[PDB]
Structure 1
């Protein structure tokens, strides 16, 4: 099958990290091309369902989405083969103060993500866990969105339950926390939090609160406030993502227009 990579074509070279599905390694495909290789730990994934969806994800192709190259499914553990991103996860990248980012670079990271999410929205495809930890950075400083949709195949109830200890409370709108109502507009809410992460250089949202306290405050209408590095116009964009009413939040196409307008006005 066109989605199937022969694992004998992989050369494993370095460890990259560990996530919800286990260890991820850096390697080469056919001795030449850089790849990341997720080694799916036994019992962590609804594997048959993922394999069917892998066909759909294969045809999601955008310059700002981390590309799915294929899967290795004829052995266990199965492998997911993706685009390699030399500079790793966006969250850690933001927290490296040596970069001494200009605010123009921060806005370009937001635009990179927003372009990927506009593409996903045009395909009616939800990320479901958009956040700085699920964005990666390549050798040119381009940010790309990673592991989109994969939350549907996580078997860990601590991650999937809204009261679960691993659930992304701090990236979730009130209707998700209250009713598990997921939609394009919960992706929009999370994108606003991601913009805040970027302009806060990777601070934890609601950093002095627990998850339980965050959920209560968000329901009462509390919001994140303006990062020091965000202009008023940039703050207006991220804040528009957090309307209590989901139908009042923008689309990613509107967010992209707004971000491009601010790039013109500030640079």
Structure 2
């Protein structure tokens, strides 16, 4: 209504129902009826004007395997990001809960969910820039969706923002990122291969016995993760294809999707 742009949600339309943890995220309703998650952005943590402009672009991204951004509440502090509600939370935690007793068919479907979202982002020339299990969410039906897409661009804490930083995603980064800060579609591809490894490893940390420094050296020497016990040879071939030293030899998300579908048919 009056005073709200298409990207702006009126926070008075929100009903807060549950604390989901930590900025802080809550579960609630929008206009009484619709489930939403509300993420409250810690003051000083984000380049807010830049994020708000990008939120307009992100509003136009729509795919069933991508967490939907509904809008932002910006007339205020902290600002809110309003999204689709994902009842089963973070993929990384979901994987680590051994009660689920996942079949490998379920693990491959999680990979396909993510790959479909990434094929969609690739088709829109939109890089994720921090793809990892910790940045995927799981709904009440067990469907995995990609979250936080592109958001690293607006983080102000310099520990997060380059390889010099102590909170940079070294373990999800190809050699050309670690060496040269060369981001591309192919750095998302590399990260996707690591995500498949996380899925088939039930949420182990990649290179779990190494520091970030040691990981960077391992990768730069041409060495890699190796096959999770739950990955078949064909699944391992797919994740490993994401880790070619030469970025241009790595597949596209379309090719990965075709490979995943082929393995689902065969296994």
Return the offset for 1:163.
Answer: 2.1
In the alignment, which residue of structure 1 is the partner of 2:129?
128
> Structure 2: how far apart are the matches of 1:85 and 1:110?
17
Return the offset for 1:171.
Answer: 0.2
State TM-score, norm by structure 2. 0.98
Q: Secondary structure at the match of 1:49?
A: helix
Q: Once structures 1 and 2 are overlaid, which stretch shifts more, 163-172 or 232-241?
A: 163-172
In the alignment, which residue of structure 2 is the partner of 1:100?
101
List runs of 5+ in structure 2 lacking aligned partners.
none
Return the offset for 1:64.
Answer: 0.2
> Structure 1: how far apart are the matches of 2:246 and 2:87?
39
- Spell out structure 1 runs of 4+ moving beyond 6 A: none
Return the offset for 1:41.
Answer: 1.0
> Structure 1: how far apart are the matches of 2:74 and 2:98?
40
Q: Secondary structure at the match of 1:188?
A: helix
Q: Deviations over 1:198-255 (max 9, x none)?
A: 0000000000000000001100011000000000000000000000000000000000
Return the offset for 1:161.
Answer: 1.9
Q: Secondary structure at the match of 1:91?
A: helix
> Structure 2: how far apart are the matches of 1:229 and 1:262?
14
What value does the CA root-mean-square deviation take over the aligned residues? 0.6
Q: Say how many residue pairs are matched.
A: 263
Alignment of 1:1-267 (within 5 A): 1-18=5-22, 22-266=23-267
Q: Once structures 1 and 2 are overlaid, which stretch shifts more, 249-258 or 23-32?
A: 23-32
Return the offset for 1:77.
Answer: 1.1
List runs of 5+ in structure 1 lacking aligned partners.
none
Q: Deviations over 1:117-163 (max 9, x none)?
A: 00000000000000000000000000000000011000010000212
> Structure 2: how far apart are the matches of 1:24 and 1:222?
38
Q: Secondary structure at the match of 1:214?
A: helix
> Structure 2: how far apart are the matches of 1:38 and 1:99?
27
Q: Deviations over 1:155-211 (max 9, x none)?
A: 010000212111000000000000000000000000000000000000000000000
Return the offset for 1:17.
Answer: 2.4
Q: Deviations over 1:79-135 (max 9, x none)?
A: 100000000000000000000000000000000000000000000000000000000
State TM-score, norm by structure 1. 0.98
